[PDB]
Design a binder for this molecule. Structure first.
Ligand SMILES: Nc1ncnc2c1ncn2[C@@H]1O[C@H](COP(=O)(O)OP(=O)(O)O)[C@@H](O)[C@H]1O
Ligand SMILES: Nc1ncnc2c1ncn2[C@@H]1O[C@H](COP(=O)(O)OP(=O)(O)O)[C@@H](O)[C@H]1O
Ligand code: SF4
Ligand code: SF4
Ligand SMILES: [Mg+2]
Ligand SMILES: [Mg+2]
Lengths: 272, 272
C-alpha cells in the first residue's frame, strides 16, 4: 500500500519547513516518499532539491504546449534521500482561481502512473487560508486520507485548524478523508504545548508532536537544506526524527468535532 | 467626494485590528467612515460594535429569502463614533468559492445607496492570502482606489505584499486602483522599520507608518474595544492617531513594481 497525507495550516506557520524535514527523516529511515507542492508559493520542495524553487507543472505544460506533452520523468525530480518532488503551481495573482493548478497536477500524476507501488508515503503541502477550489480538492476528491494540521498558539492558526476541520466534516459521507492530528510549531511561548493539546482534545484528535523554535532551521534553509541533511546531530534533527516516528506509528484518524468561537476564546484566556 | 481604501495583507498580520483602530481615530477627528468586512472570519467590525462579531449579509439574505428582501438599515450597524459597519460573509469551508460573499455584499451596498455623499472614507478589510475570486474584485472591478498593505519583517508577509502588488499591476490598464503604501505592524524585532522602508522603496511606494507591538491592544480587544476607545491616553492610541493623519494626508498612489524572489531574499540577509 501507500499512505497519502496532506499537511494544511495557515500561511507562514511552518508547513513547508516541517514537511520537508519530516520527509527527510522518513527517507533517512529507508522509506520511499513523494512530496507534491500544492501552494502557489511553489517553494515546498526547495530544501530537498537544494534549489531556489522548482519549476511548476503549470509552467512546464505551457512551455510544452499541453500537459499531455509532458512526461513524468521531466516533471518529477529526485533530491535528498531519493525523495521525489513536484510542484503544482498556479495562475498569476488576480487571474483565475489560485487553486486551479492543484487539480491539473494531481490528475497528471495519477494518469502518468506516479503512484507506483514502491512508494510508502505521499505528502501534499496545501495552502489552508481558504478551503475552496483546488485547495479543497485533496479532501473533496479523496486524495489525502490523513490530514495533519500545523498550528501554534496564535489565534489565527487555531482558527485555520478549525476551518480545515469543518471541511473534513463536510465531506465525511464520501471517501475516507480524516484528521490525523495537530502539529504544534512553537512560537516559544509559555504553556503552548498544553494549549494545542487542549485544542486537539476538543476537536477529537491528538497533538502528534511539539516542534521547538530553533535558529538552526534558518541556518539550514539559508543553505537550501533540511536540518536533517545540514546538521544530523542537532537537537532539532532529533525532533523531526521523533515526529516522523509518530506519523509512521499513528493509528488515530477521526472525523473531527469543530468548535465554536466562544470555545476558542475560552482556551486562550485559560492558558494565558 | 469620498475616498475608498482597501486594506490587504496575510492572515493574522493585524489587518482588522489596525483598520478598526485607524477608523476610530478618523471618527475621533470628525470623519464619517464605513467599514466593509471582506474576510470570511467576519470579525472585522467587532471592536467598533463592542460585539462578538456581526451577522453577515450572506447569512441575513438566506434568512430573509433573497438579498432583495434585505434593507440597508437592517444590515448596516453603527458603533463607536458613528462608524458604520457591515460584514460580507462567505460560504462554509469546502463549499463554494470563499470570496463569493464579497461580490454579493459590494453589489448590495452599491444598489441600496450605502455610498451616500456624506461619507468621507470607506475601508474594505480584505483577505490577501490569495488574490482571486471575490477577494480580487475590489481591484478587478475598481471598487478600492487606494490599497494599503499591512506587513511585517516576516518573509511570508512581504511575499503577500508582493503578490498583492502583482494583482494591482495586472489591472492597471482599467479603472484607477493604485498602491497607497505599506503599514508595518511590528513583531518587535531589530531593524524592522528599515526593512519595510527598503521594501516599499523597491516597490515604488512608501512605508506610511510603523505600528509598535503593544500589549494594550490585547487588553482592549478582550473588552471588545479599539485602543482609541479603551485608553485614549495610551502611547499606542497616539500611534493610530498618527497613522490616521498620514492616511488622510497621503498623496502618493502608484502602480507598484513587484520584485523577484532573489531581491526579497537579499533584503532579509542584508537587514539580518
Ligand atoms: N521550528 C522552526 N524554528 C525556526 N524557524 C522556523 C521553524 N519552522 C519554520 N520556521 C521558519 O518559518 C518561516 C515560514 O516557514 P514555512 O515552512 O515557509 O511556512 P509555510 O510553508 O507554512 O508558509 C520560514 O522562514 C522557516 O524557516
Ligand atoms: N500592534 C499590535 N500589538 C499587539 N497585538 C496586535 C497588534 N496588532 C494586532 N495584534 C493582535 O494580532 C492578532 C491578529 O490581528 P488581526 O487584526 O485579527 O489580524 P488579521 O485581521 O490580519 O487576520 C490579534 O490577536 C490582535 O489582537
Ligand atoms: S477564493 Fe480563489 S477563486 Fe474562489
Ligand atoms: S481559490 Fe477559492 S474557489 Fe478559487
Ligand atoms: Mg510553504
Ligand atoms: Mg481580520
Amino acid at each position: 500500500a501507500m499512505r497519502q497525507c496532506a499537511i494544511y495550516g495557515k500561511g507562514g506557520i511552518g508547513k513547508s519547513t516541517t514537511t520537508q524535514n519530516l520527509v527527510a527523516a522518513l527517507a533517512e529511515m529507508g522509506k520511499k516518499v513523494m512530496i507534491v507542492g500544492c501552494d502557489p508559493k511553489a517553494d515546498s520542495t526547495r530544501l530537498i532539491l537544494h534549489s531556489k524553487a522548482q519549476n511548476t507543472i503549470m509552467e512546464m505544460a505551457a512551455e510544452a504546449g499541453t500537459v499531455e506533452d509532458l512526461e513524468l520523468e521531466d516533471v518529477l525530480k529526485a533530491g535528498y534521500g531519493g525523495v521525489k518532488c513536484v510542484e503544482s503551481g498556479g495562475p498569476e495573482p488576480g487571474v483565475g482561481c489560485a487553486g486551479r493548478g492543484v487539480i491539473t497536477a494531481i490528475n497528471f500524476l495519477e494518469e502518468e502512473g506516479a503512484y507506483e507501488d514502491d512508494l510508502d508515503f505521499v505528502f501534499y503541502d496545501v495552502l489552508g487560508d481558504v478551503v475552496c477550489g483546488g485547495f479543497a480538492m485533496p479532501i473533496r476528491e479523496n486524495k489525502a486520507q490523513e490530514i495533519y494540521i500545523v498550528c501554534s498558539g496564535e489565534m489565527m492558526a487555531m482558527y485555520a485548524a478549525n476551518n480545515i476541520s469543518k471541511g473534513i466534516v463536510k465531506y465525511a459521507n464520501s471517501g475516507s478523508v480524516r484528521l490525523g492530528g495537530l502539529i504544534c510549531n512553537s512560537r516559544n511561548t509559555d504553556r503552548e504545548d498544553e494549549l494545542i493539546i487542549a485544542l486537539a482534545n476538543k476537536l477529537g484528535t491528538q497533538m502528534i508532536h511539539f516542534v521547538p523554535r530553533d535558529n538552526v532551521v534558518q541556518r539550514a534553509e539559508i543553505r537550501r537544506m533540511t536540518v536533517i541533511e545540514y546538521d544530523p546531530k542537532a537537537k532539532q534533527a532529533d525532533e523531526y526524527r521523533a515526529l516522523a516516528r509518530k506519523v509512521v506509528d499513528n493509528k488515530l484518524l477521526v472525523i473531527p468535532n469543530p468548535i465554536t468561537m466562544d470555545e476558542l476564546e475560552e482556551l486562550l484566556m485559560e492558558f494565558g
